[PDB]
Design a protein around this ligand. Structure first.
Ligand SMILES: Nc1ncnc2c1ncn2[C@@H]1O[C@H](COP(=O)(O)OP(=O)(O)OP(=O)(O)O)[C@@H](O)[C@H]1O
Ligand SMILES: Nc1ncnc2c1ncn2[C@@H]1O[C@H](COP(=O)(O)OP(=O)(O)OP(=O)(O)O)[C@@H](O)[C@H]1O
Ligand SMILES: Nc1ncnc2c1ncn2[C@@H]1O[C@H](COP(=O)(O)OP(=O)(O)OP(=O)(O)O)[C@@H](O)[C@H]1O
Ligand SMILES: Nc1ncnc2c1ncn2[C@@H]1O[C@H](COP(=O)(O)OP(=O)(O)OP(=O)(O)O)[C@@H](O)[C@H]1O
Ligand SMILES: [Mg+2]
Ligand SMILES: [Mg+2]
Ligand SMILES: [Mg+2]
Ligand SMILES: [Mg+2]
Lengths: 264, 8, 264, 10, 10, 264, 264, 10
DNA sequence: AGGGTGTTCCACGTGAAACAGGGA
DNA sequence: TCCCTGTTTCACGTGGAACACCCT
């Protein structure tokens, strides 16, 4: 078999990409599945969330895209036995110059991550990519390297205009760069059910997107990550929520999302 | 046997 | 006459940048000051906060930096008489190519926004610039166009590492491109004072940074923007908070902020 | 929404 | 109307 | 035919007896049925609700009970042609002395309303009796003279001990002075459904009493009279709510009550 | 030592007499005064408000007025050390008979509660009497027993005539039975200040009675008990509002009422 | 509910 | 002045999150 | 020191009632 590569992408800032990418990778790993989490963002919050401070690690994902290293070396064992991390650092932001000069040659610049992942695809069950907040090069590499994509949606006004923008960026690559690219699902995040902004933003989303919302096998209802301050607390301890409070609602909801993704 | 401490 | 150019910047996503930049610019126009809001982010949430959705933007901030348009040609008048807006677009993402092909020889590209403002700096009391979530060429341009910077701080764990990174980007520009750049302040945003994490993040911040946080120039208490869903609802109506709901917690906090700007 | 030329919104 | 002698009335 | 005599009774003060007795009598009279309302209370709030002043009335129901008048003379034509009133005043507080004297010859004294009603029962379709806040001689007469009995229930703590206590007074006479006597129905009054007190009081009442609650023919929804300050302001104008605001929720609810009583 | 005997009286049902008589007796008990609550109604809600179910009480208030038991032998200790209770029960409705066999010769049965009281009248700072919804023998007794009278006024239309009838009953007794009887004050209860009818009832009453309404001894504001479902939930736990919720508006109003009483 | 020997509430 | 609006203002229930001390 | 509790505090939605302009 070979890895399903799941990109976690939304270009809106702070909708929960890193928390989703960190906790899904951890929830998938405790099912005895081999998981590679790639911190694909220059802010490097996924790396911090697993408790690797930036100056501990020599060489990062930027140095793999450059070709100084091959991805196999830069990989770290985490607290979890089944969770591996390609860490990031702010030096990864310097890939952006390297992008517009690598599309200047072979039109190969979108695929730099995808070609880098080729050595490691038979080595993992799932590869989870944490993308930064933009539709620029790093998110495009993340999307061109992926079989499927999770969309976190903070259910607030900017998500209406914003989600729509990402789909037609996705639709663009489905007819060009990565034709096999799938929407794995829509993942309501930071969810407070009672709010009239939250109901009305979800209503409008359910008009166009309802089939693609993450749903549960055993219930049949929607999978929604609740607003839980424990999830926000967890990266301060260098941990996924699973290793912080396993009983908490947000940990429960990430383990539900694990179970959907394993099922197919 | 986890050896010398980084991390925490 | 001279405009004070203020940047609202943080590379962390979804921390209150746009909500500050729109509601500060409104709160200053309330006091009868002439205000230009520049939406400097490709996602263009500041423009959509004012009710200009874009099919209707003829030419925008991307066309000024080419020399394709002059800045007076793209300035739009809003509902607030003393507020004007320079709108933003998806086309602003292609400025990132324009920057990096000017660093090979000319190396002057960090000043592209500053020189676009030279035409309008005599005509405004305040020019408020809203920047995207990254430390790349959009933020850097605006941080080097700015006289001062306001840092919106969401009180969760990634603010700790992320702030010190942004200040190091500020110190680097203070020693090269923009020596006259000051920190106008740190504005806590989405504030929920009861949470231990909120207390915990502020304590580590006040340890190093306390002299830089916004204070009421009357009472001496900190100026923090509370978590209020009315500020989240307000851009759905194309309004700043003071037109939407002027008695709400967030509008008062944004008013108090403009008064702490208008003196020192 | 009741008088002027163009801009709406509304 | 109503019987004269106004009373309460309707 | 013959009159159905309905006692509207509760021992608890201020649960809405006079309001249901005034408004059911009017909601039955609008259907073009002949209705006599009897003010059986020394407070004479029913008389006050239909626009009669305590100095306008020459002789009252007390004068019928001692025998100085027969009931046919004491009867006043109200604002509606189908509603007649036997008025009261504070003179009826002198019946109680005349009760323990009139229980002291015979079995007589509990039945003095039954014996006064005999001359006028062929003359009305419905005769509605408004009872005072006590289980003493006036409520006893009212309950002994009647076929069916309405218990208004304010859904608040004292109704629990209270309605169980009145039911036992009912069942004593069902074994004794009036075996024909039945419970017409339970009427929730002053009803605000959101209250946890209201929810809990109606819950405890339901497991004992649900069959005896007034219900719609067209739906099967309970008939509950809402809190409507329009019902409170209506007797100040000398009017039933029907002649006052017929659109209002309390009027609609009393007309529902009329409607379901008419089917029996 | 001289106890000050206070009647809580209105013949209108459901206006707050028991709630007042219980919560004033409690609000005076926490000022370290010795307080005897005499629940003088057959319904006996004040007893039930203090969490005594009516199977517990061997001998009640009714057995004192007979001469069956002496007054000191029926007095219960409550959940507060400074409040004592003389309970009631359904057997108190048989007083009404006893009063009319006391006037077959003696005529003095209006003083039967006053004479029962003189044994405990040196042992108390305050004796609060709670009277039933009627102007009959129970209210008349407790009116001729008391030194003063607090009148609860639910501000709705029937408070207009009923107050005037109650003041006329009171002033009839200043002539004959109790010359020392004076109006301690009027307490608006169930108060909802925004209602036009509430405004309307108060305006007509203030026109005649304004100097008789309870005032705050500092601010000079009217003392009114707000509509609060906390005061209604409170007897379900067998507590006064003080032990139940001491911070709610109904409790503050009753404490404020106790301070005005405690002046003079 | 703890006490309960005095009928009892609290 | 009628029959609609939608806007403001209030009490009340709901649930997350902190924490209090009782768990032994 | 984990633990289960019940409580306290606070944002936010709900709906009745007043009210202010709007209708003619
Ligand atoms: N369900 C949740 N409840 C409460 N807080 C959350 C939740 N999910 C994430 N967070 C917190 O919200 C913030 C934003 O989440 P996160 O950093 O995962 O977003 P992001 O999409 O990665 O942001 P960026 O665009 O900056 O990369 C973080 O501070 C995190 O601690
Ligand atoms: N105090 C507040 N309370 C509640 N919601 C808020 C508050 N401030 C901002 N928001 C909402 O929070 C979300 C994120 O805030 P905002 O979009 O201003 O952050 P940003 O930093 O501009 O995001 P980006 O990183 O995408 O530029 C928005 O959906 C906005 O409506
Ligand atoms: N559904 C209702 N909503 C609001 N107010 C009401 C309602 N029903 C009755 N009222 C008002 O409540 C008060 C008490 O009601 P009412 O006088 O009908 O009770 P009662 O049982 O007749 O009392 P009493 O024992 O004094 O005879 C009155 O002032 C009346 O105006
Ligand atoms: N200020 C208040 N706010 C809300 N509810 C109240 C208030 N005062 C009393 N109540 C509740 O209103 C109801 C009537 O009050 P209460 O029983 O004290 O009046 P009462 O005059 O003793 O009645 P009765 O005529 O039966 O003697 C009770 O169910 C009580 O719980
Ligand atoms: Mg992130
Ligand atoms: Mg923004
Ligand atoms: Mg009545
Ligand atoms: Mg009472």
């Amino acid at each position: 078999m070979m890895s399903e590569i799941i990109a976690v992408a939304n270009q809106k800032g702070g909708v929960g990409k890193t928390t989703t990418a960190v906790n899904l990778a951890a929830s998938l790993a405790v099912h005895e599945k081999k998981i590679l989490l790639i911190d694909f963002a220059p802010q490097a919050n996924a790396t911090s969330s697993l408790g690797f401070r930036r100056d501990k690690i020599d060489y990062d994902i930027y140095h793999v895209l450059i070709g100084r290293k091959q991805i196999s070396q830069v990989i770290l064992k985490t607290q979890m036995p089944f969770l591996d991390l390609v860490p990031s650092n702010l030096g990864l932001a310097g890939f952006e110059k390297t992008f517009y000069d690598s599309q200047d040659e072979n039109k190969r610049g979108e695929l730099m991550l995808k070609n880098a992942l080729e050595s490691v695809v038979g080595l993992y069950d799932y590869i989870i990519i944490d993308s930064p907040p933009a539709l620029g090069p790093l998110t495009i590499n993340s999307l061109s390297a992926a079989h499927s994509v999770i969309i976190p949606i903070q259910c607030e006004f900017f998500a209406l205009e914003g989600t729509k923008l990402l789909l037609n960026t996705i639709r663009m690559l489905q007819k060009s760069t990565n034709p096999k690219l799938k929407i794995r699902g829509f993942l309501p995040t930071m969810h407070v059910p009672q709010l009239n902004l939250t109901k009305g933003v979800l209503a409008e989303l359910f008009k166009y997107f309802d089939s693609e919302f993450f749903r549960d096998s055993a219930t049949g209802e929607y999978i929604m990550i609740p607003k839980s301050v424990k999830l926000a607390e967890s990266p301060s301890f260098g941990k996924p929520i699973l290793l912080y409070d396993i009983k908490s609602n947000g940990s429960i909801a990430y383990q539900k999302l694990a179970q959907s993704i394993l099922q197919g | 046997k986890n050896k010398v401490l980084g991390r925490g």
